[PDB]
């Protein structure tokens, strides 16, 4: 009885369901769906004072499922919750679709990692892809959940749209000085090195191929069934040893490195965001904020970044958070003497 | 029994009849005939 | 089995230590 | 420069306490 | 192309007429092109 | 943009023309691989 | 003394780079 | 090891092995797990309601939120 | 340089830079993905108390992993006609994705060198009377203007910072 | 009514509706 | 066991050595607790709990020690404030010395268990392979945890045979230690209710005693034994790491949000008490109650306690420090020497002006003075060439009520321009940055540092949980799949 | 106490620079 | 032949280092 | 900080003394 359903879900179809597909397909379909519902139809006028739908007039770059109203706090904003009282429209005007999307997305991400584990167990391979997927989930939980929980409200989370993310990026520089954050520097290093490794390994394989065909199109020199290497690891090791000084000699270590580099970068950036939830910032170097203030001649690129951050902060915040009602007169706004 | 608690219990009692066992009583029917 | 650390792992470990220390030195000094 | 004093001694134990560990592990592997 | 002859039309026209009749603006509370400045950020939680 | 793509395309055809005339533009010969017939680069190896 | 730490650590990266090129473990074919 | 230490070197050796003696013994079939499933849904309901109650989604008289 | 460039050119709204971001983040995705797949379907050669990297011998001719098993896993993960069966095509894609996208983002820097900046959507959504409804691009402008009026402070004697 | 008929329609019965709505939005005078 | 990252698996099949290496982690943990508290007390300033509490001084372990019952030292003093002569036996030192002695004893016991690994407890009677019965051991352990929970919450927190726990008023001025009756109703789920904590521990002690008794006499089902890899101790590690990272997130959240367990006399205020102006509204409400009690403005404003005014410093928000601004809070703004009094800014037209306080987000903030209407009336300019507003152009005067400047009025542009900077940081205070060589840049409290570290701990223990769950399930294919 | 500042760092490198050497030599002997 | 250092030599070396350092610490501090 | 060095070094002598008695290399008869 109970075994029949297990045998059902483990079947070979066009899309594998599995047991994880109960916690993945009902959530992901909602989260993805609530984005398309949001970015087509609902406004951010009552949460943000901005327009963020195709119905407003926005395009794909400037639509978002923006974060909830700043007065909603860290409320879950359930549809039946007190802030909507079951009323659908009042739930969409206060940014309840952001919480719908974010919660269904984190459950979809859990369901997808469970799916990766389940399919590895069914087929019988190691679960390294789920381990590698723990880095996007660490980043998702840091950016969309841990950061707004550490802040005032869900409002300061990232909106589910392109330009909302661009605002989030510039907000993080101006208010957080996030480029100066070393955990983010390791994140950048990990991601850039992951892209370097991807490119260099693909081109190295493609240029150390064996003559396993007769045509000039070398893409037909490989069969799925063959048990032999399609590219010379010896020639590749020789080339990179005499170009770069070092080379891989172990194929398994190479492909573990290709796993390890972007995953650990992405995890280190998640650590940096976890720090920015509590405002624990690598904002400044105390020695240089001191020296530049005892010496009106000491200019470094860092001091010019601190000035740029103040310029961003004062010239964004009056329309970034409109619940705060920041009033800055034109003559306290830091200008650079236009 | 504040309204914000009545809706909480009602969401329990409704979503049990939305995804918990509309889907399970359908999984039984669809697992008996795709054995 | 006894523990190993081959030469390549030693060089990799030395660089990751040395570069990570160079990165975090500026912030330990503040 | 108003820098952290212990920032020197934090920098050098951060980078040679692991380093000697690696050399210990390497040397005992090589012998 | 037989059972979907009108099925694809009926659905597409349904979405078109959902926008065109103005039901979308009332469906999601979206401000119409002249409800923006007759600006109201909601300032309270339990009663928006 | 045109100068950059055409410098890339020139590098492509320069490498490919050299390799096709040489006789190794379709891959490494499995029968004889040039690195296998080269002396080691490591100074300790004799 | 803050520049001294930076220069010493940079010398450690340079020494590791030299020793990992010059005195590297030879890759033997099988 | 096949030889254990003397009882003078470890007095509580055999008195505490009786507890570590049926390692691997199970009950056949699904066991008492049907009650375990009821508790896995009840404790998840408890965690959900206590989170909603902390969060102020559930405002019952008694919680200042 | 990044901040001043955003202030003066709005690179975030430049499509070549969106391609560059897709390239670097997707190259990291594909690097982690390809590495986890080759690592996950390794042929058993070693014991559990020794590194799996000892299963490969430098110059061994035999394939050290199972393309079939990694392929079957990836295909079950998304759909059937998605997983590369072929490996030569697979590594051409690994080469091509971040290389082509970094080509495009280098080209984006280069056309912004001639002041052909990114997309501009300021004052683009108007209400019935004509009032500008702010969008998210407007908020990005407002932050870029923040950066814009603070860079090279004692060096713009006229209000128009040209190139 | 099968599994094939639901995993190709729950994604596409809404999608055509959305596309029809968005095509109507290209003709809205605001 | 041969790769460096696998070496501790040499005790994975050796439960006597496993107990040894656990007792050594215990010795290190307790020795760290003892030595850290000794270092926290060598650096502690107990002279005043009003302006130099432990949360301003970077005290990490001291709040946790004093939250249960140990508030007074053998030196006489107490973190509540009173000096006496007979501070019981359980002082701040006795606790650290007890942990140091425990650490020494545990080091010796770990030495014994490393040497005498081959005892017939860890090998079953029928064969001689090393095994530990995880369901039985789990039941015994769950029962032990149940008695300890039940007892701690029903005898140490109630105070029946225990010191009690720290309770406080909402304003956080009357912080003391007393035994708390349990709260079984809905009121027990109030986060700022200590009877809820007491009732939680009682109820969960009964629950864990019953579950431990059920996990000692009932063997696991044959499907769940192989399903959850119950013979694999690694699987136990994975589930424990799950409990460990989700507790870390809950602990970090309840430290950042503030519960009855983290009161503000020990960990200081939260950032959310500054965000909503909690102490600001409290003081305004108290002041106006005194004003309507026939008292003068200066007389009402001088009954505000210095401890109640100090909570309105944004320098005491835990969301205002930095990642690498290391150390204690008084390493930043400095040592507070006194409350300057409530500043009341008045324009040249005789209008009540209020300086916009700065939020937690801003490293620096434009000083802009509003009025009852909320229109800008003065500010500290930047462009100063079309600046229609401004202190000296409008002639803004600051007059203080309460504190050290009670009755004093300032009208100099320099002085008003300075006190309008200190007014946006909350209640103005005088800071001596010479005692601690304070650099002037704000630092987070022990509340902020604990929350941030235990969030990092939650994240890495999430990964460690995943790593060991995947290793426990996929044990058969770790070396590789199949030829 | 007017003691040499570097007398701390002289004391600890005098006594652990040789010490790690010995441990290196011991560990590689034991393995 | 490779270098050795047996356990007894390690203990002797550690004590001679540690006691000599304790002796000369008082004079390095001065 | 001068007493700290002395106490740390004395702890190092005490640790060496313990480990050279407790965990000493066994003297085997030939
Ligand atoms: C790794 C992968 C892990 C697996 C992913 C699992 C996904 C689960 C998703 C849970 C998200 C919960 C958010 C609920 C809102 C919230 O929490 O809501 C926060 C509320 C507290 O509310 C805040 O309380 C403060 C006190 C002030 O009043 C603030 O204004 C008010 O917003 O607490 C609460 O509900 C109680 C919660 C306290 C614990 C929060 C820990 C987060 C650490 C943040 C630092
Ligand atoms: C895990 C649960 C728990 C914890 C963390 C504590 C913690 C504490 N209790 Mg306690 N207690 C508990 C359960 C607990 N109790 C239960 C179930 C009861 C009922 C019997 C009591 C009854 C009790 C009394 C009567 C007293 C305490 C006291 C204390 C404090 C001093 C004891 C100490 O730390 O020495 C730590 C010990 C070690 C580190 C071990 C080293 C010892 C070896 C032999 C050396 C301390 C913070 C004392 C107090 O009030 O503090 C001022 C006190 O008088 N408790
Ligand atoms: C009637 C008796 C009684 C009373 C009055 C209480 C009262 C209380 N219990 Mg409880 N309890 C009882 C009986 C009782 N209990 C019994 C019989 C059991 C056995 C099941 C329990 C088991 C239990 C647990 C496991 C917990 C409580 C907790 C609590 C406190 C909740 C308030 C709080 O701080 O929120 C805190 C926690 C929550 C509101 C739930 C958080 C769960 C999160 C949302 C899960 C998801 C987070 C994820 C893992 C990490 C996030 C990652 C990223 C996305 C942020 C409260 C005072 C909680 C507590 O003590 O917190 C410190 C708690 O965790 N109790
Ligand atoms: C899951 C059961 C559970 C939960 C939710 C708690 C929760 C709590 N305990 Mg605790 N405790 C427990 C079991 C539990 N305990 C058991 C079995 C013992 C026996 C040793 C104790 C002994 C103990 C002591 C001595 C103290 C606490 C204290 C606390 C509070 C501070 C720690 C914290 O906030 O993070 C929450 C802890 C977690 C594990 C969160 C994770 C929950 C699941 C795994 C997710 C907190 C609300 C401190 C307190 O403030 O009491 C007055 C305190 O001093 N506990
Ligand atoms: C209760 C916690 C716990 C325990 C008992 C273990 C136990 C184990 N882990 Mg593990 N792990 C954990 C948490 C834990 N882990 C967490 C939280 C993570 C994510 C950060 C990991 C990620 C992880 C990986 C990737 C691996 C293991 C492995 C192992 C096994 C080999 C032991 C080893 O690595 O030694 C070797 C370690 C060293 C020789 C030096 C490491 C030095 C560290 C980096 C610095 C030490 C910091 C400090 C001194 C420790 C204090 C921590 C503090 C925050 C509390 C072992 C059974 C390995 C395995 O699977 O076995 C085959 C393996 O590859 N773990
Ligand atoms: C060994 C490697 C260590 C690497 C980490 C070091 C952390 C930064 C060191 C910066 C520093 O100068 O510390 C020295 C400071 C001393 O305190 C600081 O001293 C400085 C030196 O003059 C300045 O005077 C500062 O103003 C003062 O606050 O101590 C710390 O704050 C270190 C706290 C570390 C806590 C880590 C918790 C880990 C949790 C797990
Ligand atoms: C590593 C181990 C080193 C052990 C030897 C250290 C020598 C004594 C160190 C004392 C000291 O404080 O040095 C520090 C002094 C620095 O100079 C001194 O600094 C002190 C610190 O504040 C005081 O200020 C003194 O007044 C000042 O003279 O440098 C030396 O004099 C060391 C000279 C060593 C020359 C050795 C030559 C060996 C020849 C072969
Ligand atoms: C407005 C533009 C519209 C017109 C201009 C063309 C634009 C479309 C793209 C290119 C058009 C020509 C096709 C060339 C592809 C090809 O066959 O070579 C690719 C070879 C062909 O192999 C071979 O491929 C054969 C067919 S197929 O490729 O498998 O379909 C197969 O039979 C054979 O066995 C195999 O070896 O291998 C592949 O199939 C790999 C495909 C991956 C390449 C695309 C990667 C893009 C990512 C980065 C780019 C960023 C985007 C900005
Ligand atoms: C600048 C200060 C900062 C220093 C930074 C540098 C860090 C280096 C860390 C250690 C890296 C080397 C590990 C071992 C490599 C190897 O085995 O090489 C072995 C080679 C021989 O090559 C080999 O020889 C082997 C046979 S044999 O050695 O010739 O017998 C053969 O097997 C092998 O294939 C062949 O390659 O030679 C050596 O013996 C190297 C050991 C030297 C010790 C490390 C250098 C110490 C610093 C020197 C400068 C002093 C600085 C003074 C100022 C403070
Ligand atoms: C207090 C801080 C200052 C520390 C001062 C102490 C310095 C010690 C230096 C190293 C001396 C020991 C060398 C090796 C001895 C030996 O092999 O023992 C082997 C023995 C087993 O005995 C043995 O066991 C062997 C077999 S086996 O090990 O059991 O497998 C067997 O062959 C042998 O006959 C038997 O005797 O056990 C060990 O593994 C000892 C290694 C522990 C590492 C050194 C201690 C590290 C400090 C611990 C406290 C941390 C301090 C934290 C605060 C900073
Ligand atoms: C012998 C003996 C004794 C004694 C004892 C003692 C005296 C002790 C002690 C102890 C101690 C004194 C301890 C301790 C500890 C500590 C610890 C254990 C710690 C730590 C740490 C850590 C872990 C950290 C790490 C790190 C850092 C450094 C920072 C950050 C990063 C990292 C993480 C890396 C007696 C007589 C009693 C008895 C008999 C025996
Ligand atoms: Cl600039």
């Amino acid at each position: 009885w109970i075994k029949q359903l297990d045998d059902w879900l483990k079947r070979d179809r066009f899309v594998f369901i599995g047991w994880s597909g109960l916690l993945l397909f009902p959530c992901s379909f909602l989260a993805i769906g609530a984005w398309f519902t949001g970015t087509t139809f609902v406004t951010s006028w009552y949460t943000h004072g901005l327009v963020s739908s195709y119905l407003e007039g926005c395009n794909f770059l400037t639509v978002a499922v923006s974060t909830p109203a700043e007065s909603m706090g860290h409320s879950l904003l359930l549809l039946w919750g007190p802030e909507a009282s079951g009323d659908f429209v009042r739930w969409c005007q206060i940014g309840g679709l952001w919480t719908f999307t974010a919660l269904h997305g984190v459950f979809g991400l859990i369901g997808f990692m469970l799916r990766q584990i389940e399919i590895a167990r069914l087929v019988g391979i190691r679960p390294y892809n789920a381990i590698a997927f723990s880095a996007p989930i660490a980043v998702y939980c840091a950016t969309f959940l841990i950061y707004p929980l550490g802040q005032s409200s869900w409002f300061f989370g990232p909106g589910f749209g392109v330009s909302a993310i661009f605002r989030f990026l510039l907000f993080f520089q101006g208010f957080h000085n996030y480029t100066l954050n070393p955990f983010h520097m390791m994140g950048v290093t990990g991601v850039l090195g992951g892209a370097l490794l991807c490119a260099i390994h693909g081109a190295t394989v493609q240029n150390t191929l064996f003559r396993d065909n007769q045509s000039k199109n070398t893409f037909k020199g490989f069969s799925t069934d063959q048990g032999e290497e399609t590219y010379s690891m010896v020639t590749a090791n020789r080339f990179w040893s005499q170009i770069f000084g070092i080379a891989f000699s172990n194929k398994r270590w190479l492909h573990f490195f290709m796993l390890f580099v972007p995953v650990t970068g992405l995890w280190m950036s998640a650590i940096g965001m976890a720090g920015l939830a509590f405002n624990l910032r690598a904002y400044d170097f105390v020695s240089q904020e001191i020296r530049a203030a005892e010496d009106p001649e000491f200019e470094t690129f860092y001091t010019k970044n601190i000035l740029l951050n103040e310029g961003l902060r004062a010239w964004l915040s009056e329309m970034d958070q409109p619940a705060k009602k920041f009033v800055f007169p034109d003559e306290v706004l830091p200008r650079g003497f236009s | 029994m504040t309204p914000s608690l009545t809706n909480f219990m009602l969401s329990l009692l409704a979503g049990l009849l939305i995804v918990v066992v509309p889907a399970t009583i359908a999984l039984i029917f669809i697992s008996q005939r795709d054995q | 089995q006894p523990v190993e650390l081959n030469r390549t792992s030693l060089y990799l470990g030395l660089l990751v230590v040395f570069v990570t220390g160079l990165l975090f030195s500026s912030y330990f000094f503040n | 420069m108003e820098t952290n004093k212990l920032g020197f001694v934090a920098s050098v134990l951060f980078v040679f306490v692991p380093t000697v560990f690696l050399l210990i592990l390497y040397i005992q592997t090589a012998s | 192309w037989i059972i979907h002859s009108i099925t694809i039309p009926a659905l597409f026209i349904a979405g078109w007429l959902f926008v065109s009749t103005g039901l979308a603006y009332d469906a999601f509370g979206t401000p119409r092109p002249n409800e923006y400045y007759p600006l109201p950020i909601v300032d309270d939680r339990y009663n928006p | 943009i045109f100068g950059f793509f055409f410098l890339v395309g020139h590098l492509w055809h320069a490498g490919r023309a050299r390799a096709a005339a040489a006789g190794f533009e379709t891959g490494l010969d499995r029968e004889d691989e040039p690195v296998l017939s080269m002396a080691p680069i490591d100074p300790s190896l004799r | 003394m803050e520049a001294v730490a930076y220069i010493l650590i940079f010398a450690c990266i340079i020494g590791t780079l030299f020793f990992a090129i010059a005195f590297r473990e030879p890759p033997k074919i099988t | 090891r096949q030889k254990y230490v003397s009882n003078k070197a470890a007095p509580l050796q055999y008195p505490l092995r009786k507890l570590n003696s049926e390692a691997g013994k199970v009950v056949p079939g699904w066991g008492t797990a049907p009650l375990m499933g009821i508790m896995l849904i009840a404790l998840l309901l408890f965690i959900l309601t206590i989170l909603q109650l902390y969060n102020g989604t559930v405002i019952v008289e008694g919680i200042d939120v | 340089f990044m901040f001043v460039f955003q202030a003066e050119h709005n690179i975030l709204m430049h499509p070549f830079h969106m391609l560059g971001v897709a390239g670097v983040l997707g190259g990291s995705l594909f690097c982690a993905m390809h590495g986890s797949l080759v690592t996950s379907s390794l042929v058993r050669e070693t014991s559990d108390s020794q590194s799996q990297n000892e299963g490969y011998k430098f110059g061994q001719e035999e394939e050290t992993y199972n393309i079939l098993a990694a392929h079957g896993y990836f295909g079950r993960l998304i759909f059937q006609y998605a997983s590369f069966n072929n490996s030569r095509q697979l590594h051409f894609f690994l080469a091509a994705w971040p290389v082509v996208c970094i080509w495009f983002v280098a080209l984006g820097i280069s056309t912004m060198a001639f002041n052909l900046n990114g997309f501009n959507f300021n004052h683009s959504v108007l209400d019935s009377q004509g009032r500008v409804l702010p969008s998210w691009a407007d908020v990005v402008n407002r932050a870029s203007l923040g950066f814009e009026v603070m860079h090279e402070r004692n060096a713009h004697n006229f209000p128009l910072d040209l190139a | 009514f099968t599994i094939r008929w639901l995993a190709i329609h729950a994604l596409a019965i809404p999608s055509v509706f959305f596309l029809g709505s968005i095509a109507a939005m290209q003709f809205i005078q605001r | 066991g041969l790769p460096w990252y696998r070496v501790h698996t040499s005790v994975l099949n050796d439960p006597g050595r496993l107990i040894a290496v656990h007792i050594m982690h215990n010795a290190l943990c307790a020795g760290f607790a003892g030595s850290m508290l000794l270092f926290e007390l060598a650096l502690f300033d107990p002279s005043d709990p009003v302006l130099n509490p432990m949360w301003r001084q970077g005290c990490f372990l001291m709040p946790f020690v004093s939250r249960l019952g140990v508030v007074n030292s053998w030196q006489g003093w107490s973190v509540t404030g009173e000096t006496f002569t007979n501070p019981g036996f359980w002082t701040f030192e006795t606790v650290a010395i007890a942990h140091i002695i425990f650490s020494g004893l545990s080091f010796l016991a770990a030495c014994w268990h490393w040497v005498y690994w081959d005892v017939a407890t860890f090998f079953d009677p029928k064969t001689d392979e090393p095994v530990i019965d995880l369901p039985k051991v789990f039941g015994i352990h769950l029962t032990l945890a149940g008695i300890l929970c039940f007892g701690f919450g029903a005898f140490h927190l109630t105070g029946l045979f225990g010191p009690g726990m720290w309770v406080s008023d909402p304003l956080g001025l009357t912080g003391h230690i007393q035994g708390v009756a349990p709260e079984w109703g809905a009121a027990g789920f109030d986060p700022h209710n200590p009877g809820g904590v007491v009732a939680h521990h009682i109820a969960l002690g009964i629950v864990a005693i019953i579950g431990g008794l059920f996990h000692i006499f009932v063997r696991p089902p044959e499907y769940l034994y192989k399903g959850l890899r119950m013979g694999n101790i690694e699987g136990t590690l994975a589930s424990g790491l799950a409990v460990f990272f989700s507790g870390a997130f809950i602990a970090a959240g309840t430290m950042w949000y503030g519960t009855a367990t983290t009161p503000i006399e020990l960990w200081g205020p939260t950032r959310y008490q500054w965000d909503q102006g909690f102490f600001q509204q409290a003081i305004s409400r108290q002041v106006k109650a005194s004003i309507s009690d026939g008292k003068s403005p200066s007389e009402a404003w001088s009954e505000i306690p210095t401890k109640l005014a100090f909570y309105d410093y944004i320098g005491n928000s835990p969301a205002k420090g930095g990642l690498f601004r290391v150390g204690r809070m008084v390493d930043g703004d400095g040592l507070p020497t006194g409350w300057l009094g409530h500043p009341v800014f008045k324009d040249g037209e005789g209008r009540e002006l209020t300086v916009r306080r700065m939020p937690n987000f801003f490293e620096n903030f434009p000083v802009v003075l509003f009025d009852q209407d909320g229109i800008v009336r003065a500010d500290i300019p930047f462009r100063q060439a079309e600046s229609k507003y401004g202190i000296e152009q409008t002639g803004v005067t600051v007059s203080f009520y309460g504190g050290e400047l009670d009755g004093q009025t300032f009208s100099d542009p320099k002085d008003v321009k300075k006190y309008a900077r200190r007014a946006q940081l909350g209640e103005p205070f005088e800071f001596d940055r010479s005692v601690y060589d304070s650099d002037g840049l704000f630092r987070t409290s022990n509340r902020g540092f604990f929350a941030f570290f235990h969030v990092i701990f939650g994240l890495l223990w999430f990964f460690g949980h995943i790593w060991h769950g995947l290793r426990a399930l996929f044990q058969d294919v770790f070396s590789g799949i199949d030829p």
Side-chain angles (χ1 to χ4, degrees), chain F residues 1 4-5 8 12 26 30, chain I residues 16 61 88 103-104 107 111:
Chain F
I1 281 172
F4 160 71
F5 289 90
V8 168
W12 179 275
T26 40
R30 266 175 196 272
Chain I
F16 279 8
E61 183 33 51
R88 280 154 181 241
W103 284 347
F104 272 95
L107 284 178
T111 120

Side-chain angles (χ1 to χ4, degrees), chain B residues 1-33 35:
Chain B
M1 186 64 138
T2 61
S4 121
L5 183 65
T6 313
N7 296 115
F8 160 72
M9 287 198 236
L10 268 179
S11 76
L12 304 179
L13 290 173
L16 190 152
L17 277 298
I18 287 171
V19 71
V20 175
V21 286
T24 306
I25 199 68
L27 293 174
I28 301 299
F29 267 107
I30 207 74
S31 287
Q32 303 289 298
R33 66 182 122 138
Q35 293 177 335

Side-chain angles (χ1 to χ4, degrees), chain K residues 34-114:
Chain K
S35 293
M36 191 50 101
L37 194 56
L38 287 186
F39 163 87
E40 245 120 294
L41 275 286
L43 269 63
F44 187 60
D45 176 300
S47 61
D48 60 308
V50 171
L51 289 173
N52 211 29
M54 53 171 96
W55 45 272
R56 295 264 322 169
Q57 308 186 30
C59 291
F60 159 50
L61 293 190
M62 263 193 48
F64 292 94
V65 182
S66 55
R67 151 181 83 168
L68 298 182
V70 181
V71 297
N72 62 7
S73 179
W74 64 23
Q75 284 171 292
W77 55 266
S78 179
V79 303
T80 47
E82 58 266 34
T83 66
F84 27 34
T85 61
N86 190 236
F89 156 73
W90 294 116
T91 66
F92 278 121
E93 300 58 23
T94 46
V95 167
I97 301 299
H99 290 79
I100 292 315
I101 301 299
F102 179 79
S103 178
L105 297 185
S106 290
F107 164 83
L108 291 194
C111 289
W112 186 94
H113 268 282
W114 189 264

Side-chain angles (χ1 to χ4, degrees), chain K residues 156-174:
Chain K
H156 165 102
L157 294 175
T158 61
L160 299 171
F161 165 76
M165 65 180 288
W166 191 289
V167 298
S168 179
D169 75 301
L171 285 183
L173 305 162
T174 47

Side-chain angles (χ1 to χ4, degrees), chain K residues 322-343:
Chain K
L323 169 62
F324 281 105
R325 297 175 192 169
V326 304
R328 67 180 67 89
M329 294 177 71
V330 301
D331 273 335
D333 44 30
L335 180 65
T337 44
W339 176 40
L340 284 187
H342 187 195

Side-chain angles (χ1 to χ4, degrees), chain A residues 209 211-212 216 229 232 235, chain F residues 25 27-28 30 33 39 41:
Chain A
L209 295 178
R211 294 179 67 188
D212 305 322
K216 300 290 94 175
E229 79 193 296
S232 172
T235 303
Chain F
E25 96 282 49
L28 282 162
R30 266 175 196 272
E33 182 178 0
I41 56 187

Side-chain angles (χ1 to χ4, degrees), chain A residues 299 301 304-305 308, chain I residues 4 147 150-153:
Chain A
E299 182 86 329
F301 282 99
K304 319 213 7 151
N305 289 341
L308 286 183
Chain I
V4 171
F147 284 139
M150 298 279 322
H151 105 298
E152 278 139 15
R153 66 186 183 274

